[PDB]
Each structure stands twice: as C-alpha cells, then as structure tokens.
Design a protein around this ligand. Structure first.
Ligand SMILES: Cc1cc2nc3c(=O)[nH]c(=O)nc-3n(C[C@H](O)[C@H](O)[C@H](O)COP(=O)(O)O)c2cc1C
Ligand SMILES: Cc1cc2nc3c(=O)[nH]c(=O)nc-3n(C[C@H](O)[C@H](O)[C@H](O)COP(=O)(O)O)c2cc1C
Lengths: 182, 181
C-alpha cells in the first residue's frame, strides 16, 4: 500500500491540535492501531493497551480532564493546547501500559518506553494515511481511569486525538478496547 | 526509502550483522530521524553517543551480559549481546530526566527516548539497515566507558548495520556525540 515514504513521514509529522469533524474511516483507524500493535516491546511482552473513544459526551469529559490549572501546571505546559482537540476529534485513543509486562530495572520504568515506541508507530501511521494526532501527556489520571473503567493497576500514559486536520503479536482485540476498558 | 506502513510492519529486531560499513549519509538520515521526534514540551531530552571503535564496541558487548540474579523480565540471557560487538555502529541512547515530564510518578523521559528510538529504528530499516533495542546492560560501567555523567540516564543500545510547521529542534551537534560523551 502507498501511504508515505518513511523518512518523509518522520520529518513532516506534526502535533495536530485542530481537527475537522470529518469521520475517520474504520479502515484507516485499523491501519493506525495495527501499526501500534506491530511495535517492538520489551521481550515482545506488549504491555501497551488502547481504549478507543468515539462518544461525543465521553470525549467532552476527557477534554475537561486535560485542563491545566496554572497552580498545578506541569513542566513546560502552562496550558494544555490540545484540550479542545480532545473534544473536537472524531476519535480519541487512550494509550495505557501494564508496568509488570515490561522491564523494571535500574529504577527505570520500561513500560513508559514501550508505550512511547508504540505511540510513535501510531502517530507516524496516522500521518502517513492523511490523519493528524498529538501526544497528550497532561490529564487527571484517576478521573480518566474512573470514566473509562480502567483498573488502577493500569497506568495511563497518553491521549491521542485522531482525525483529519483542519515473533507473533497478541490479537488486536486483546490490547484494544472499544469505548471503555474491558 | 520505504513506505511508512510497510516499514512499520516489516521492521525486525536484527541481532546478526554483516561487516559492510554504514554509509555516512545513511547514518545521518537515521540520527536526523531521531532528532525529528516529538517530545514533552519540545524539550528533547534524548541524547545519542555514536560508537564505531572496534575495541569499545567489544567492551559494550562485554557489558550487556545478564547476571542471573538481575535477570529482567523475559531475558534470562541477552540474545543481542554479540550484535553489539559485530555491528559497524552502536548508538547509545540516553535521556536527561529533568528535560521531560515527571508527574503521577511517571518518568516521561523514558517515553521520549522510546519515541526517538522508534524513529531511529524505523528510519534504519527504511534505508536497508537493521537494528535492535537493547535494554539489558550495566549502566554504571557503560557510563564510565563512554564518559557519560551519572545524572544522564542510559536507556538503550542500538547495534546498527546490514543484516547477514513545527517548533525548532536542538541542533544535531548538541544531541549527537561522536565516540564518547
Ligand atoms: C525496550 C526494549 C528493550 C529490549 N531489549 C532487548 C535486549 O536486551 N536484548 C534483545 O535481544 N532484544 C531486546 N529487545 C527486542 C525485543 O526482544 C523485540 O523487539 C521483540 O521480541 C519483538 O520482536 P521484533 O522487534 O523482531 O518485532 C528490546 C525491545 C524493547 C522494546
Ligand atoms: C510525552 C509527550 C507528552 C505531550 N503532551 C502534550 C500535551 O499535554 N499537550 C500538547 O498540546 N502537546 C503535548 N505533546 C506534544 C509536544 O508538545 C510536541 O510534540 C512538541 O512540541 C513538538 O511539536 P511537533 O510534534 O509538532 O513536532 C506531548 C508530547 C510528548 C512526546
């Protein structure tokens, strides 16, 4: 399939924060999630998990949870410029990690690295088929988990607005959940 | 190079390398790909030491052995150990933890290096090269060997070779170091 040259995709990929309301073809959504699934992971343990969120009301709640209060502003983000994107995008993908399914040594959380690898696949694949996304790291984790029925032992790592800009792997259905955690 | 989806699908962990030299141009494309990675607040905490010296690469290989007592998840032995010695190039990927998010007790520098090294690995595969993420190594001795300060964290080793409108990035000469830190 002809998407985009790898070097070109890597160079031209941008954080997209403004989305049209044009629907994402499930065929493209599948190519994006397949790319994430194809990611290398610590010992092929594949600790990444994804919740695909499409409901308007639920997306609006997620957007609210990604607000930055100046008092609690994390490093480098005085505001969260991707906040409205989480509301506007037809699809929001919530990327999580099972920490016990990746390396834990030298005080380092390799699940964070594994999810980074998988989400860079996800973002490059999306850009390659004409979609846009942005890694969102700022959000209230406990409220988000509560909203999506994500168990507290699962760690949420990033949110990915997805839409049109304005050695065997586990089955897709084992690492991607529709609407809420299963 | 190669179609993005195809490269993502066909990329493999390569652990056996030929002795064909890596063309300077390809090495640069691979490092530039890592430089182009997105990162927490564009702070770009990733750093890279490019090692080519035969003896230093042997030492790195010597350092990526698994001690039974410290055997991490799924790696009773390190299958990529010989690769570190064989490969024409080893890229040592590091992170500056203070230059990425640290909240909810999560080390986002690990995520940022993960992102940059997936660019590196995809780019490498796209131009006909092979690589493998090596997470198993003795960080202290490796840091000493390569003059890497202990406040800098080493995240991954990358044998590299042949198989047998966004915000400004930091310049390449500030994140890529030749031979040693
Ligand atoms: C964070 C990370 C660390 C890794 N460390 C090692 C390692 O120390 N030794 C090794 O042989 N492979 C290592 N790998 C490679 C995995 O074993 C490999 O990616 C996985 O089994 C999937 O196979 P594939 O890359 O060919 O698709 C590592 C991979 C990741 C993502
Ligand atoms: C780990 C991580 C967390 C991020 N969190 C946010 C975020 O919360 N809000 C936002 O607008 N962008 C976020 N970004 C996007 C970066 O700000 C962006 O990648 C960087 O500024 C470079 O821009 P570019 O992606 O267009 O090259 C995040 C990126 C990374 C890698």
């Amino acid at each position: 399939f002809q998407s985009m040259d790898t070097l070109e995709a890597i160079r031209t990929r941008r954080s997209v924060r403004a989305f049209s309301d044009r629907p994402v073809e499930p065929e493209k959504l599948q190519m994006v999630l397949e790319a994430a699934r194809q990611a290398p992971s610590w010992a092929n343990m594949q600790c990444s998990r994804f919740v695909v969120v499409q409901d308007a009301e639920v997306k609006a709640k997620i957007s609210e949870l990604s607000f930055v209060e100046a008092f609690f502003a994390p490093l480098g983000y005085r505001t969260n410029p991707a906040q409205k994107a989480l509301a506007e995008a037809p699809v929001v993908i919530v990327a999580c990690g099972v920490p016990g399914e990746s390396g834990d040594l030298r005080g380092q959380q390799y699940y964070m690295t594994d999810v980074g690898i998988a989400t860079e696949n996800l973002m490059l694949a999306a850009h390659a088929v004409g979609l846009g996304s942005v890694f969102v790291g700022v959000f209230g984790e406990e409220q988000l988990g509560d909203l999506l029925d994500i168990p507290p032992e699962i760690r949420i790592v990033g949110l990915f607005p997805l839409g049109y800009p304005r050695p065997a792997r586990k089955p897709l259905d084992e690492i991607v959940f529709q609407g809420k955690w299963k």
